[PDB]
From a paper:
The [name] enzyme from [name] (MtFolB) is a potential target for anti-TB drugs due to its essential role in the survival of the bacillus and the absence of [name] homologues in humans. MtFolB exhibits three activities: aldolase, epimerase, and oxygenase. As an aldolase, this enzyme catalyses the reversible conversion of 7,8-dihydroneopterin (DHNP) to 6-hydroxymethyl-7,8-dihydropterin (HP) and glycolaldehyde (GA) in the folate biosynthesis pathway. Additionally, for MtFolB, the residues Tyr54 and Lys99 play essential roles in the epimerase and aldolase activities of [name] and it is indispensable for the survival of the bacillus.
The crystallographic structure of the [name] enzyme from [name] (MtFolB), complexed with its inhibitor 8-mercaptoguanine (8-MG), was elucidated at a resolution of 1.95 Å. The crystals diffracted at 1.95 Å resolution and were resolved in the space group P4212, with two MtFolB chains in each asymmetric unit. We found an octamer as the most likely quaternary structure of this complex in solution. Interestingly, Goulding et al. have shown that MtFolB is unique among known [name] enzymes for the fact that the apoenzyme is a tetramer in solution. The octameric structure of MtFolB in complex with 8-MG also presents these major structural changes when compared to the apo-tetrameric form. Loop L1 and the α2a-helix are ordered, while loops L2 and L4 also have shifted positions. Therefore, binding of inhibitor 8-MG to MtFolB induced the major structural changes previously observed upon substrate binding (DHNP), product formation (HP + GA), and complex formation with HP, both in terms of quaternary structure and local rearrangements of loops and helices. 8-MG forms hydrogen bonds with 4 MtFolB residues (Asp53E, Tyr54E, Ile73G and Glu74G). The residues Tyr54E, Ile73G and Glu74G are involved in interactions with all synthesised compounds, as well the 8-MG. Although 8-MG is a non-competitive inhibitor capable of binding to both the free enzyme and the enzyme-substrate binary complex, the crystallographic structure obtained shows that 8-MG binds near the active site of MtFolB.
Numbering used by the authors:
A (entry chain A), B (entry chain A), C (entry chain B), D (entry chain A), E (entry chain A), F (entry chain B), ...: 2 to 119
Write the structure that this text describes.
């Protein structure tokens, strides 16, 4: 099927298991992939016939910026829940990246990806 | 099966739902992936036996540069339509990236991917 | 000489010459370089003896997100003028990047750099 | 299902078939992908209900830093073995990258990916 | 199953449909992905029990550097043919990238991927 | 001092010493740096008081896409000479990159930088 | 003049002004530039006649990983002071990057550069 | 002033202090910068009136791939010394990067820069 892909949505947040993570918070990066039939929207060229990526980005960002979760799993589940509330969506993958996570090791990124589908 | 992959085709355009997007326009980036049997072309080493990526790039670019669509969904559908008119193609994915989209949030990219297959 | 370097401060703003740019705004990316003697701060290990990079980032961001200017020159000069209130500062160089500027050509970046010094 | 993705874990090691590789060693880069149901952890927001990426990174790094293997296949199998010892994990992919491998040719990366599943 | 991934193998060549491409030639970039069971090699830690990526890189590079093909399809088929001559290999994908291809448009990369499997 | 920095202007052209380079042409990448007093423009916020970066990009691109030169030195000098018609300009530095230049060695970039000043 | 350039030395540390930063620490990235006459070393091809970049990296890393400082200025000055014990060194410039610094704004990097010279 | 800039010339070599480095060798990356008056070449558009960047790349590569030196200082000085045979050259700066150098710390790059001038 077709898909809408949002990549690199960068939002300051305070999610974290440990107290020290919630004093000042850190950078979070969100990807969203939405599986949805896009044929109708190419016929109508009407935004109402697709899933608006402007609303998706603002909603995703507000969740990330909101009151902190312990787990990024829970942040990703809240974003995925939002996407599936649109009955046209077949499936969604939400990647919550925590690239500044406190890990004593040298690494590029750590993330969870929450998948949902009908 | 085999595939031809065009990546990062960068073309100025004016697509957009909102009037202000069509005054000066913005950068669009296209990826095309074509699924097609390539064994015959390796036997003949004859360009006529494969899907010419030179024609693909020019056709994709002309569509993107053409009169604006409201939706990038519609741009991607027009490119995908072109590819499937070649009876040898099994499937195609066209990614239309709108990395400068007007979104109040900080993000790397937003795109739609239009998939077609036999 | 000693310097403090802030790179890639990313802030949504509405600066621009043309009406179409004030509707939704666009991404701005700020670099600041501050020339300042840092020996005292290294001797004391006291934040008071250096220029706090948090103050540097937060104030520059407030300017960028604030009242729209027509020119990025004007934004850079405001940031630079405020930095030189700190009498310990020898010179400052503010780069205001407008990577999304509406230009019909394909390019990576456009920016102005404002310098001020004692 | 859901997944946890660790990327770019960078650890000095001495793995290698050839003696000269084990005198000083070289840079290794590890990716780990873990397939696991994350719904319960979003309900509880309890780290105990997910696979802790802090422990994963330290365990992966200790293996890579440990006494050398001849093959990076064997390093990847040891990491994958560790992940599957958690009964909640459905599958895992461990990529062991050896980007400095002694190869007379110019190349970006060489890696093995060890996959396991129930 | 498991896989060996070679990425970014960079080799000067002269492949091309058009005469002017074969006077001086251009940069080619090869990726190879090999699907093969790696469990035995982790048990033995014996290079003889896996597919040696040193030989793969040299063989791939020699093909690319060899007498020119008209099509990169044909270069990729020759590399893939080589890999499948090892009876242990389940499948292979060879990506031949021609990032400097003569295309009047602005683009990041163009490539063909030749897939083979048992 | 104050400057305007255009980076990565990307334009197809046919410059080159050898016949084979004039058949299809290749990618050129232009940087321009203009040294100019920007205080007045920041005071007035009037585009007329600075060097318009649109004029900078469009004119440089027209030169690059125009009559082929044998040397990139000649292209850079043309761009630089035209920029110094603006008497407010202290100096200009034009880098003409030829990233795709036919060289048998593997390299990232080759470029010439032309400077002019009062 | 002649110089030795170490870039991107990556070391976990616990420097920072705030208590929350000393709990788990964060990534620090060091650059060192050493101005030194290298003609003798090129004449002799003797490591003793130059500044050994292994000594440069290992000692800088030991400082970064060592007792936590409040300011990165203090870290940079320690590295620089120790480098100038070598009387052959004309000048040294140490950049201490704190890419993960807790700042509420979105930014790429923050760093201080300490310079010392005869 | 005017200059010619070659960046990222990539050549396998066997330079190094330690025996283990001469067995298989490693990647070296060369930059050359040549300060030279380019007005005449832009006037004539004659390759003879400038420094040919093909000669620059091919000769530097031959040195890098040639007899192994213990120090990268020695390699850089050889490249620089040969460049200054051209009496039109004001100065040259050769950077020899050893990105794969055996250092136990994690780092991006290590290099020496050799300068020569009239
Ligand atoms: N999978 C997972 N592991 C974690 N460890 C810590 S601390 N925080 C987390 C987290 O948010 N998710
Ligand atoms: N999916 C989608 N959403 C949009 N929102 C706006 S504005 N424009 C678009 C668009 O072109 N596609
Ligand atoms: N130097 C300069 N030129 C411009 N052209 C436009 S439009 N906007 C600008 C600008 O903000 N600065
Ligand atoms: N597949 C594979 N091939 C190799 N060649 C050498 S040397 N070392 C290796 C290795 O660790 N894995
Ligand atoms: N698919 C494909 N199309 C091409 N066009 C030209 S020219 N050369 C090629 C080629 O090698 N492969
Ligand atoms: N400096 C310089 N050298 C060249 N060699 C060739 S071919 N073309 C050029 C060129 O355009 N400039
Ligand atoms: N210049 C400077 N400013 C800072 N602000 C904080 S918090 N930490 C620092 C620091 O380490 N250096
Ligand atoms: N300056 C410098 N230091 C080194 N240490 C080793 S080992 N090799 C080198 C070298 O080639 N140059």
């Amino acid at each position: 099927a077709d898909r809408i892909e949002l990549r690199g949505l960068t939002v300051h947040g305070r999610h974290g298991v440990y107290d020290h993570e919630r004093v000042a918070g850190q950078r979070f990066v969100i990807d969203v992939t939405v599986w949805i039939d896009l044929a109708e929207a190419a016929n109508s060229d009407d935004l109402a016939d697709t899933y608006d990526y402007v609303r998706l980005a603002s909603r995703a960002a507000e969740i990330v910026a909101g009151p902190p979760r312990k787990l990024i799993e829970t942040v990703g589940a809240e974003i995925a829940d939002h996407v599936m509330d649109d009955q046209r969506v077949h499936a969604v993958e939400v990647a919550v990246h925590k690239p500044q996570a406190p890990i004593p090791q040298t690494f590029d990124d750590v993330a969870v990806v929450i998948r949902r589908s009908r």
